Amino acid sequence: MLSGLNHLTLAVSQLAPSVAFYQQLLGMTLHARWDSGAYLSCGDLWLCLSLDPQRRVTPPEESDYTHYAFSISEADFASFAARLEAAGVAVWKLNRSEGASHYFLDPDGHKLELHVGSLAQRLAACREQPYKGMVFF
């Protein structure tokens, strides 16, 4: 069977600013870089940044809702979000429709999120405040 996410690969238009964003600003661990990419980890996540001449810097109104959320503790969430805000990181969403989340953009407009809580916790919250038509299995 399939057992989870092996890796996330993001196409990037400029490798150095993207490496700096994920490593310096978001605090991910940089393991290797080469002329056309980089490998980082975020806990158990394997992140690949791949230099792609096809990647465009995409405003959030032009892309769909596909997005990548990273886990952060309740204790660290607000100060990390505020630090991104103070650093000028662009946002893409404000309404918290799926719990405690901060929605921000990477240098190419990849839609990112800081989120506090697991799937189990989200399902429990949804039982009390369900999305319209929601059914649980």
Added chain:
Amino acid sequence: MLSGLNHLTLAVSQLAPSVAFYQQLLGMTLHARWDSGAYLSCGDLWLCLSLDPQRRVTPPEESDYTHYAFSISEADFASFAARLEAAGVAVWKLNRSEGASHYFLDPDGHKLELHVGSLAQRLAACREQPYKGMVFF
């Protein structure tokens, strides 16, 4: 500090075929569904399918290299690839890297991959045969 990938959210144009693809074809566990989305799990991965009228069914030549790889064992790889082939699922790339990989498209053109092997395995291979310009940290 970020501790991992919290969830992956894919924008989908039609919820029913996307649920069928991820749950029935790919074998992921469906935990909940509502009028505009679904929550599934695949090992530790929390996957959200979000119904989005802005999602275009996107040919692979028209999207960048951003992609999502799922883990599978070497022993299970060939039969899973054959399942996708029997189902007529399109391939967007041939494998030319270390570790088995099958590159396939979801119903909306999201670029997916089955991959065998960890970041540690990839780094070990790269240390022996570094990519052009490769530096390790």
